[PDB]
mmCIF file of C-alpha atoms (C1' of nucleotides) and ligand atoms in Angstrom:
data_model
loop_
_atom_site.group_PDB
_atom_site.id
_atom_site.type_symbol
_atom_site.label_atom_id
_atom_site.label_comp_id
_atom_site.label_asym_id
_atom_site.label_seq_id
_atom_site.Cartn_x
_atom_site.Cartn_y
_atom_site.Cartn_z
ATOM 1 C CA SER A 24 172.634 -169.966 123.032
ATOM 2 C CA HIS A 25 175.754 -170.212 125.791
ATOM 3 C CA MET A 26 175.580 -169.351 129.033
ATOM 4 C CA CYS A 27 172.385 -169.602 132.313
ATOM 5 C CA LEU A 28 169.485 -166.385 131.327
ATOM 6 C CA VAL A 29 169.113 -166.082 135.531
ATOM 7 C CA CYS A 30 172.598 -166.791 137.110
ATOM 8 C CA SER A 31 175.191 -165.623 133.543
ATOM 9 C CA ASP A 32 176.793 -168.509 134.805
ATOM 10 C CA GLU A 33 177.259 -171.401 131.443
ATOM 11 C CA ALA A 34 173.718 -173.076 130.947
ATOM 12 C CA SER A 35 173.388 -176.770 131.165
ATOM 13 C CA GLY A 36 170.046 -177.463 129.252
ATOM 14 C CA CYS A 37 167.117 -175.892 128.842
ATOM 15 C CA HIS A 38 164.842 -176.371 131.807
ATOM 16 C CA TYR A 39 161.583 -175.341 133.202
ATOM 17 C CA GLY A 40 161.303 -173.374 128.978
ATOM 18 C CA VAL A 41 164.063 -171.531 129.266
ATOM 19 C CA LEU A 42 168.071 -171.985 128.601
ATOM 20 C CA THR A 43 169.384 -172.236 132.361
ATOM 21 C CA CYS A 44 172.286 -173.607 134.386
ATOM 22 C CA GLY A 45 171.634 -176.595 137.020
ATOM 23 C CA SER A 46 171.640 -174.956 140.306
ATOM 24 C CA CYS A 47 169.053 -172.289 139.130
ATOM 25 C CA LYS A 48 166.920 -175.465 137.266
ATOM 26 C CA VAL A 49 166.780 -176.946 141.062
ATOM 27 C CA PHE A 50 166.854 -173.580 143.155
ATOM 28 C CA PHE A 51 163.829 -172.913 140.817
ATOM 29 C CA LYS A 52 161.634 -176.103 142.253
ATOM 30 C CA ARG A 53 162.605 -175.759 145.386
ATOM 31 C CA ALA A 54 161.766 -171.794 145.642
ATOM 32 C CA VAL A 55 158.483 -172.473 144.326
ATOM 33 C CA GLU A 56 157.272 -176.614 145.636
ATOM 34 C CA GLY A 57 158.822 -175.412 149.270
ATOM 35 C CA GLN A 58 156.219 -171.694 148.529
ATOM 36 C CA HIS A 59 159.156 -169.598 151.122
ATOM 37 C CA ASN A 60 158.121 -166.444 150.763
ATOM 38 C CA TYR A 61 161.523 -164.882 149.845
ATOM 39 C CA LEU A 62 161.879 -161.134 151.485
ATOM 40 C CA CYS A 63 165.186 -159.175 149.612
ATOM 41 C CA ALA A 64 167.919 -157.213 151.623
ATOM 42 C CA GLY A 65 167.777 -154.696 149.433
ATOM 43 C CA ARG A 66 165.548 -153.092 147.284
ATOM 44 C CA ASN A 67 164.701 -155.871 145.082
ATOM 45 C CA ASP A 68 167.135 -155.186 141.893
ATOM 46 C CA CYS A 69 169.996 -157.855 143.567
ATOM 47 C CA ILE A 70 172.881 -159.110 140.779
ATOM 48 C CA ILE A 71 172.486 -161.779 139.671
ATOM 49 C CA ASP A 72 175.232 -163.496 138.933
ATOM 50 C CA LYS A 73 177.841 -166.360 139.360
ATOM 51 C CA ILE A 74 178.962 -165.585 142.427
ATOM 52 C CA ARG A 75 176.141 -163.672 143.933
ATOM 53 C CA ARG A 76 173.799 -165.611 142.914
ATOM 54 C CA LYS A 77 173.208 -167.019 146.728
ATOM 55 C CA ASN A 78 173.048 -163.752 147.810
ATOM 56 C CA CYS A 79 169.596 -162.998 147.263
ATOM 57 C CA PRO A 80 166.950 -166.254 146.582
ATOM 58 C CA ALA A 81 163.507 -163.821 146.116
ATOM 59 C CA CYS A 82 165.569 -161.652 143.954
ATOM 60 C CA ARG A 83 166.854 -165.344 141.920
ATOM 61 C CA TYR A 84 163.154 -166.265 142.243
ATOM 62 C CA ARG A 85 162.522 -163.449 140.757
ATOM 63 C CA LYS A 86 164.786 -163.183 137.529
ATOM 64 C CA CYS A 87 164.195 -167.122 136.678
ATOM 65 C CA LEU A 88 160.031 -166.064 136.667
ATOM 66 C CA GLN A 89 160.674 -162.976 134.186
ATOM 67 C CA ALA A 90 163.205 -165.793 131.583
ATOM 68 C CA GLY A 91 159.442 -167.338 132.342
ATOM 69 C CA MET A 92 160.141 -170.015 133.863
ATOM 70 C CA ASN A 93 157.562 -172.657 134.604
ATOM 71 C CA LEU A 94 157.613 -176.172 135.665
ATOM 72 C CA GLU A 95 154.795 -176.875 134.033
ATOM 73 C CA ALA A 96 156.628 -176.186 130.038
ATOM 74 C CA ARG A 97 155.923 -179.217 128.465
ATOM 75 C CA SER B 26 169.292 -154.188 176.277
ATOM 76 C CA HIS B 27 169.194 -158.363 174.387
ATOM 77 C CA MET B 28 168.851 -158.374 170.744
ATOM 78 C CA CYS B 29 171.409 -159.243 168.397
ATOM 79 C CA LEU B 30 173.337 -155.647 167.802
ATOM 80 C CA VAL B 31 173.785 -157.297 164.077
ATOM 81 C CA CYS B 32 170.601 -158.921 163.497
ATOM 82 C CA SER B 33 168.878 -157.991 166.381
ATOM 83 C CA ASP B 34 167.880 -161.364 166.723
ATOM 84 C CA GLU B 35 167.782 -162.197 170.750
ATOM 85 C CA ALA B 36 171.423 -162.069 171.382
ATOM 86 C CA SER B 37 172.788 -164.077 174.071
ATOM 87 C CA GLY B 38 175.381 -162.343 175.462
ATOM 88 C CA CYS B 39 179.084 -160.141 174.699
ATOM 89 C CA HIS B 40 181.302 -161.681 172.211
ATOM 90 C CA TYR B 41 183.831 -160.315 170.992
ATOM 91 C CA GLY B 42 182.135 -156.834 173.151
ATOM 92 C CA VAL B 43 179.046 -157.164 171.632
ATOM 93 C CA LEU B 44 175.155 -157.832 172.372
ATOM 94 C CA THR B 45 175.448 -159.971 169.529
ATOM 95 C CA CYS B 46 173.137 -163.484 169.509
ATOM 96 C CA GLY B 47 174.937 -167.721 169.304
ATOM 97 C CA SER B 48 174.375 -167.535 165.006
ATOM 98 C CA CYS B 49 176.492 -163.890 164.607
ATOM 99 C CA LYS B 50 179.232 -164.633 167.058
ATOM 100 C CA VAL B 51 180.274 -167.271 165.064
ATOM 101 C CA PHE B 52 179.733 -165.215 161.773
ATOM 102 C CA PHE B 53 182.266 -162.878 162.401
ATOM 103 C CA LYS B 54 184.366 -165.607 164.557
ATOM 104 C CA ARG B 55 185.226 -167.931 160.800
ATOM 105 C CA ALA B 56 184.703 -164.151 159.037
ATOM 106 C CA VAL B 57 188.008 -163.331 160.684
ATOM 107 C CA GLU B 58 189.836 -166.304 161.102
ATOM 108 C CA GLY B 59 189.538 -166.886 157.085
ATOM 109 C CA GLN B 60 188.858 -165.100 154.566
ATOM 110 C CA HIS B 61 185.677 -162.933 153.969
ATOM 111 C CA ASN B 62 186.296 -161.796 149.440
ATOM 112 C CA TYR B 63 182.507 -162.006 149.860
ATOM 113 C CA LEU B 64 180.593 -159.208 147.858
ATOM 114 C CA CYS B 65 177.437 -157.603 147.751
ATOM 115 C CA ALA B 66 174.772 -158.439 145.607
ATOM 116 C CA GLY B 67 172.790 -154.984 146.061
ATOM 117 C CA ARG B 68 174.747 -151.963 147.320
ATOM 118 C CA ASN B 69 176.018 -152.422 150.451
ATOM 119 C CA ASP B 70 173.929 -151.383 152.657
ATOM 120 C CA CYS B 71 170.919 -154.910 152.994
ATOM 121 C CA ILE B 72 169.063 -155.129 156.387
ATOM 122 C CA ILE B 73 170.356 -157.860 158.437
ATOM 123 C CA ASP B 74 167.656 -159.232 160.243
ATOM 124 C CA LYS B 75 167.347 -163.053 161.599
ATOM 125 C CA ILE B 76 166.089 -164.600 158.632
ATOM 126 C CA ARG B 77 167.840 -161.309 155.622
ATOM 127 C CA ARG B 78 171.404 -162.706 157.543
ATOM 128 C CA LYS B 79 171.801 -165.104 155.005
ATOM 129 C CA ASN B 80 170.620 -163.032 152.622
ATOM 130 C CA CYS B 81 174.871 -161.221 152.771
ATOM 131 C CA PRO B 82 177.922 -161.954 154.174
ATOM 132 C CA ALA B 83 179.824 -159.584 152.382
ATOM 133 C CA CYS B 84 177.447 -156.566 154.365
ATOM 134 C CA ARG B 85 176.906 -159.696 157.145
ATOM 135 C CA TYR B 86 180.439 -158.425 158.022
ATOM 136 C CA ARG B 87 180.411 -154.808 157.878
ATOM 137 C CA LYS B 88 177.351 -154.145 160.757
ATOM 138 C CA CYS B 89 179.892 -156.695 162.974
ATOM 139 C CA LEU B 90 182.667 -154.358 162.102
ATOM 140 C CA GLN B 91 180.725 -151.696 162.742
ATOM 141 C CA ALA B 92 179.977 -152.993 165.833
ATOM 142 C CA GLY B 93 182.469 -152.700 166.893
ATOM 143 C CA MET B 94 183.628 -156.875 166.686
ATOM 144 C CA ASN B 95 186.939 -157.855 167.746
ATOM 145 C CA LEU B 96 188.205 -161.480 168.585
ATOM 146 C CA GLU B 97 190.004 -159.843 171.587
ATOM 147 C CA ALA B 98 187.880 -157.720 173.420
ATOM 148 C CA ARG B 99 186.993 -159.872 176.474
ATOM 149 C CA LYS B 100 191.285 -159.807 176.673
ATOM 150 C CA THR B 101 191.604 -156.072 176.427
ATOM 151 C CA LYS B 102 188.185 -155.354 178.370
ATOM 152 C CA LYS B 103 190.464 -156.941 181.507
ATOM 153 C CA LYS B 104 193.268 -154.830 182.048
ATOM 154 C "C1'" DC C 30 168.786 -184.726 126.109
ATOM 155 C "C1'" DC C 31 165.408 -183.216 130.144
ATOM 156 C "C1'" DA C 32 162.897 -183.992 135.606
ATOM 157 C "C1'" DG C 33 163.670 -185.439 140.119
ATOM 158 C "C1'" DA C 34 166.259 -187.982 142.518
ATOM 159 C "C1'" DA C 35 170.254 -188.669 145.744
ATOM 160 C "C1'" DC C 36 174.124 -187.661 147.080
ATOM 161 C "C1'" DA C 37 177.667 -184.384 148.244
ATOM 162 C "C1'" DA C 38 179.302 -179.238 149.967
ATOM 163 C "C1'" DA C 39 178.535 -174.781 151.049
ATOM 164 C "C1'" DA C 40 177.034 -172.349 154.232
ATOM 165 C "C1'" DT C 41 174.295 -171.156 158.899
ATOM 166 C "C1'" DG C 42 172.348 -172.225 163.997
ATOM 167 C "C1'" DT C 43 173.116 -174.964 168.648
ATOM 168 C "C1'" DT C 44 175.100 -176.963 172.571
ATOM 169 C "C1'" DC C 45 178.994 -178.560 175.065
ATOM 170 C "C1'" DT C 46 183.593 -177.895 177.493
ATOM 171 C "C1'" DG C 47 187.218 -174.721 179.406
ATOM 172 C "C1'" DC D 5 180.154 -165.054 180.877
ATOM 173 C "C1'" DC D 6 182.101 -166.605 177.423
ATOM 174 C "C1'" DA D 7 186.505 -168.810 174.434
ATOM 175 C "C1'" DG D 8 186.795 -172.230 171.010
ATOM 176 C "C1'" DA D 9 185.253 -176.881 169.610
ATOM 177 C "C1'" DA D 10 182.327 -180.481 168.696
ATOM 178 C "C1'" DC D 11 178.527 -180.950 166.122
ATOM 179 C "C1'" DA D 12 174.137 -180.148 164.054
ATOM 180 C "C1'" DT D 13 170.787 -177.619 159.981
ATOM 181 C "C1'" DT D 14 170.316 -175.748 155.839
ATOM 182 C "C1'" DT D 15 171.384 -173.945 151.257
ATOM 183 C "C1'" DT D 16 172.645 -174.909 147.508
ATOM 184 C "C1'" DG D 17 175.476 -177.650 144.346
ATOM 185 C "C1'" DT D 18 176.916 -182.197 141.244
ATOM 186 C "C1'" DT D 19 175.560 -186.887 139.138
ATOM 187 C "C1'" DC D 20 172.996 -190.435 139.332
ATOM 188 C "C1'" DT D 21 167.752 -192.580 136.796
ATOM 189 C "C1'" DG D 22 163.403 -192.437 134.640
HETATM 190 ZN ZN1 ZN E 15 172.360 -170.366 136.459
HETATM 191 ZN ZN1 ZN E 16 167.193 -158.522 146.007
HETATM 192 ZN ZN1 ZN E 17 172.776 -162.044 165.593
HETATM 193 ZN ZN1 ZN E 18 175.399 -156.204 150.924
#
DNA sequence: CCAGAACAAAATGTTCTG
DNA sequence: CCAGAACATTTTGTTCTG
């Protein structure tokens, strides 16, 4: 397709198994490797789009996983 | 009290007219000196505590405004 | 073309100085 | 005590290298 499946910015290729942009790729790797235990400040349903992808690591990461991102993709 | 009224961290003094920590103080000064065209990803009531104050500058700024913060606070107090 | 590194920028937080 | 500044860290994002 065309746009990132996590944040709807334009995607840069298939990363960790899913079409995504560069920032989401590294965010996802950092999230998993850092074990940050992110906590949403709203209702676990934050809108994650181009401007607001910084707004909630908990929801962004959740949206990553739901899109099927995984580190040992291939 | 001595906890920040914006985020409930340890307040460090009365800054721009309200008990706040140093981080909220400078966050507000910066929001006020420049642009604060932020956008909330939830429902404009995000919970602002020590860790999550980073998540939503839109709501963090709102809770500063709502607490009465203003730059001329200290000068107005001397009047 | 992609993962991870390395570099860079944005955003946040702390100590210094008037 | 508290303002702004200066210094410092964190967080996110882009380009480079394997
Ligand atoms: Zn993305
Ligand atoms: Zn959220
Ligand atoms: Zn605070
Ligand atoms: Zn918010």
